Motif scaffolding. Structure first.
Motif, mmCIF file in Angstrom:
data_model
loop_
_atom_site.group_PDB
_atom_site.id
_atom_site.type_symbol
_atom_site.label_atom_id
_atom_site.label_comp_id
_atom_site.label_asym_id
_atom_site.label_seq_id
_atom_site.Cartn_x
_atom_site.Cartn_y
_atom_site.Cartn_z
ATOM 1 N N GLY A 1 -74.789 25.833 -58.501
ATOM 2 C CA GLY A 1 -75.528 25.121 -57.473
ATOM 3 C C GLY A 1 -76.688 24.306 -58.017
ATOM 4 O O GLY A 1 -76.898 24.244 -59.224
ATOM 5 N N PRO A 2 -77.454 23.679 -57.121
ATOM 6 C CA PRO A 2 -78.573 22.837 -57.555
ATOM 7 C C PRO A 2 -79.835 23.610 -57.908
ATOM 8 O O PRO A 2 -80.840 22.983 -58.260
ATOM 9 N N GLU A 3 -79.808 24.943 -57.844
ATOM 10 C CA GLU A 3 -81.045 25.716 -57.899
ATOM 11 C C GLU A 3 -81.739 25.578 -59.251
ATOM 12 O O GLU A 3 -82.960 25.394 -59.312
ATOM 13 N N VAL A 4 -80.985 25.676 -60.348
ATOM 14 C CA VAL A 4 -81.608 25.622 -61.669
ATOM 15 C C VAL A 4 -82.261 24.263 -61.892
ATOM 16 O O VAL A 4 -83.400 24.170 -62.367
ATOM 17 N N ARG A 5 -81.542 23.185 -61.564
ATOM 18 C CA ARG A 5 -82.126 21.853 -61.675
ATOM 19 C C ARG A 5 -83.344 21.712 -60.771
ATOM 20 O O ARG A 5 -84.382 21.193 -61.195
ATOM 21 N N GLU A 6 -83.237 22.174 -59.520
ATOM 22 C CA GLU A 6 -84.356 22.046 -58.586
ATOM 23 C C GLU A 6 -85.593 22.757 -59.110
ATOM 24 O O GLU A 6 -86.709 22.228 -59.021
ATOM 25 N N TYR A 7 -85.418 23.964 -59.649
ATOM 26 C CA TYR A 7 -86.569 24.738 -60.101
ATOM 27 C C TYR A 7 -87.148 24.162 -61.390
ATOM 28 O O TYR A 7 -88.374 24.126 -61.564
ATOM 29 N N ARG A 8 -86.285 23.706 -62.305
ATOM 30 C CA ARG A 8 -86.776 22.996 -63.485
ATOM 31 C C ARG A 8 -87.580 21.764 -63.081
ATOM 32 O O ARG A 8 -88.644 21.492 -63.649
ATOM 33 N N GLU A 9 -87.088 21.013 -62.092
ATOM 34 C CA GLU A 9 -87.815 19.846 -61.598
ATOM 35 C C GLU A 9 -89.173 20.234 -61.029
ATOM 36 O O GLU A 9 -90.159 19.515 -61.220
ATOM 37 N N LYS A 10 -89.243 21.361 -60.320
ATOM 38 C CA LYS A 10 -90.510 21.794 -59.741
ATOM 39 C C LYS A 10 -91.523 22.110 -60.835
ATOM 40 O O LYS A 10 -92.669 21.652 -60.787
ATOM 41 N N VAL A 11 -91.112 22.897 -61.833
ATOM 42 C CA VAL A 11 -91.996 23.202 -62.955
ATOM 43 C C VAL A 11 -92.378 21.924 -63.691
ATOM 44 O O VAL A 11 -93.543 21.720 -64.053
ATOM 45 N N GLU A 12 -91.405 21.036 -63.901
ATOM 46 C CA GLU A 12 -91.667 19.778 -64.594
ATOM 47 C C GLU A 12 -92.706 18.941 -63.855
ATOM 48 O O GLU A 12 -93.616 18.372 -64.471
ATOM 49 N N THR A 13 -92.595 18.864 -62.529
ATOM 50 C CA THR A 13 -93.565 18.098 -61.750
ATOM 51 C C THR A 13 -94.955 18.718 -61.836
ATOM 52 O O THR A 13 -95.962 17.999 -61.905
ATOM 53 N N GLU A 14 -95.031 20.050 -61.832
ATOM 54 C CA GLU A 14 -96.322 20.719 -61.946
ATOM 55 C C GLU A 14 -96.939 20.480 -63.320
ATOM 56 O O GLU A 14 -98.149 20.247 -63.431
ATOM 57 N N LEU A 15 -96.116 20.516 -64.370
ATOM 58 C CA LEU A 15 -96.588 20.206 -65.718
ATOM 59 C C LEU A 15 -97.105 18.775 -65.804
ATOM 60 O O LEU A 15 -98.174 18.520 -66.372
ATOM 61 N N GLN A 16 -96.341 17.819 -65.265
ATOM 62 C CA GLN A 16 -96.782 16.430 -65.293
ATOM 63 C C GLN A 16 -98.085 16.252 -64.529
ATOM 64 O O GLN A 16 -98.930 15.437 -64.917
ATOM 65 N N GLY A 17 -98.278 17.004 -63.446
ATOM 66 C CA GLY A 17 -99.522 16.885 -62.706
ATOM 67 C C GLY A 17 -100.720 17.355 -63.511
ATOM 68 O O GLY A 17 -101.784 16.735 -63.474
ATOM 69 N N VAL A 18 -100.557 18.447 -64.259
ATOM 70 C CA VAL A 18 -101.638 18.932 -65.112
ATOM 71 C C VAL A 18 -101.933 17.932 -66.227
ATOM 72 O O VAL A 18 -103.097 17.631 -66.515
ATOM 73 N N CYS A 19 -100.893 17.387 -66.863
ATOM 74 C CA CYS A 19 -101.126 16.376 -67.890
ATOM 75 C C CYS A 19 -101.855 15.174 -67.310
ATOM 76 O O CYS A 19 -102.817 14.678 -67.909
ATOM 77 N N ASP A 20 -101.430 14.707 -66.130
ATOM 78 C CA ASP A 20 -102.088 13.561 -65.508
ATOM 79 C C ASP A 20 -103.546 13.872 -65.193
ATOM 80 O O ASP A 20 -104.420 13.008 -65.337
ATOM 81 N N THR A 21 -103.828 15.106 -64.775
ATOM 82 C CA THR A 21 -105.205 15.502 -64.485
ATOM 83 C C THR A 21 -106.075 15.412 -65.731
ATOM 84 O O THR A 21 -107.187 14.873 -65.687
#
Ligand SMILES: *Cc1ccc(C(=O)Nc2ccn(C)n2)cc1
Ligand SMILES: *Cc1ccc(C(=O)Nc2ccn(C)n2)cc1
Ligand SMILES: [Cl-]
Ligand SMILES: [Cl-]
Lengths: 227, 9, 227, 9
Positions: free
Chosen positions: A74-94
């Motif tokens: 299912g899409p769960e692994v991709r979805e959760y990787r995307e969520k962590v990835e977005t949170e990481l990118q937000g910290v880098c942007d900060t």
């Protein structure tokens, strides 16, 4: 953190480090930066340690999830990787936002300017680790440009054993090897950095000698892995 | 390949 | 997590555990509980592991800050300890709310009911660790009452080697020693639990033997520390 | 004094 005193934010950042509460530590140091005053040497280290731990946990989690995702392909692994990835990118942007508003432009001394520019290269490097296309090339060039300006200043203004200069060269060499697909440049930089530091060790006190040789060992460890 | 740990102090 | 499928929440909880993202894991399992269906044996373990890790980090940080605060006796150390303490209490209240709405009342089998009641005792115990007055006594009694109902069921419905029964007795003994100021009760419970399990080991398979003897070693470790 | 670790699986 606008209602808390700058000194209290710094004090609480140190407490959060002792409690291994690095998310709190980063929020406290973010508040301290946003007070608008320049940061002392110690304060710069607190800012760096806080965000390095936060993004370090995110990078480790992203690598776990990316590895599971690649094994499934299912899409769960991709979805959760995307969520962590977005949170990481937000910290880098900060972090990059703090450097741009306005730590770097007010940093005149070599020790502060090289420190912040190395940070800029590091957090663009973390963005590059998870980037794919249309932006990966520009992100890689942003990391390279920050590292390069830091290198130019450190070669002009710092002795070859300066721990900031050594750690900058170490991370730039990792950038070359892991991000830029330039392992020969990585090896050459690590070797030249190590050799020039070795020749400068005779000038140092016992404590400075320990600081510099610790980082030279990290360069040596990488060369051993790469050759 | 290790970057600066930089997680302490 | 109302818009995510129950099965996807469970799958993502398992991924978060692999990534050591325990805050995410707890939020996913909270969402799964709020779907309103009972939890399987595996799902109960996921809920427990997630929140145990979250509150485990908070308890460790609280102990660091409480120790610094006691050595000092500005407001910063107290303020930050209070902040961590409030966050810890919120997590405990969240878990207790899940058990009360409505995990415990729908749990009819001994394995599920003892599991949830042990959880209830544990999270009241964590509240008791940071409580002081007007409420500490009532919190301690709430922990004792939950543990006691779990003990009564486990003695009636489970063999002496059942890992849930053993872990409940272990934690109740820790409650007696650390919270209730009853070290003799703690030692007596740990000893009787160990001895009755030892006499039942002959009934077990190789794998069940390993599960039970692991927890009996934890009882033995405590007795060694307490005597 | 150790409670159940219960941090894995
Ligand atoms: C990028 C970076 C991070 C940390 C160091 C470091 O360890 N510096 C240090 C050690 C002792 N003193 C006085 N400074 C270097 C580079
Ligand atoms: C309170 C508690 C938590 C965890 C355990 C445990 O380790 N149980 C276990 C091991 C093997 N199997 C099948 N269950 C016990 C008690
Ligand atoms: Cl997700
Ligand atoms: Cl605070």
């Amino acid at each position: 953190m606008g209602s808390m005193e700058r000194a209290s934010l710094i004090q609480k950042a140190k407490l959060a480090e002792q409690a291994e509460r690095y998310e709190d530590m980063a929020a406290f140091m973010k508040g301290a930066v946003e007070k608008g005053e320049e940061l002392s040497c110690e304060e710069r280290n607190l800012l760096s340690v806080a965000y390095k731990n936060v993004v370090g946990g995110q990078r480790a989690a992203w690598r776990v999830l990316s590895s599971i995702e690649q094994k499934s392909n299912g899409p769960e692994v991709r979805e959760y990787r995307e969520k962590v990835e977005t949170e990481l990118q937000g910290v880098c942007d900060t972090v990059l936002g703090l450097l741009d508003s306005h730590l770097i432009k007010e940093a005149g001394d070599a020790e502060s300017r090289v420190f912040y520019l190395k940070m800029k290269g590091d957090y663009y490097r973390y963005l590059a680790e998870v980037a794919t296309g249309d932006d990966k090339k520009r992100i890689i060039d942003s990391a390279r440009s920050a590292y390069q300006e830091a290198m130019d200043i450190s070669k002009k203004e710092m002795p070859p054993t300066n721990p900031i200069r050594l750690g900058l060269a170490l991370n730039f060499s990792v950038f070359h090897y892991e991000i830029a697909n330039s392992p020969e440049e990585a090896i050459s930089l690590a070797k030249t950095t190590f050799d020039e530091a070795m020749a400068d060790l005779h000038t140092l006190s016992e404590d400075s000698y320990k600081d510099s040789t610790l980082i030279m060992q990290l360069l040596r460890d990488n060369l051993t892995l790469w050759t | 390949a290790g970057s600066i740990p930089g997680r302490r102090s």
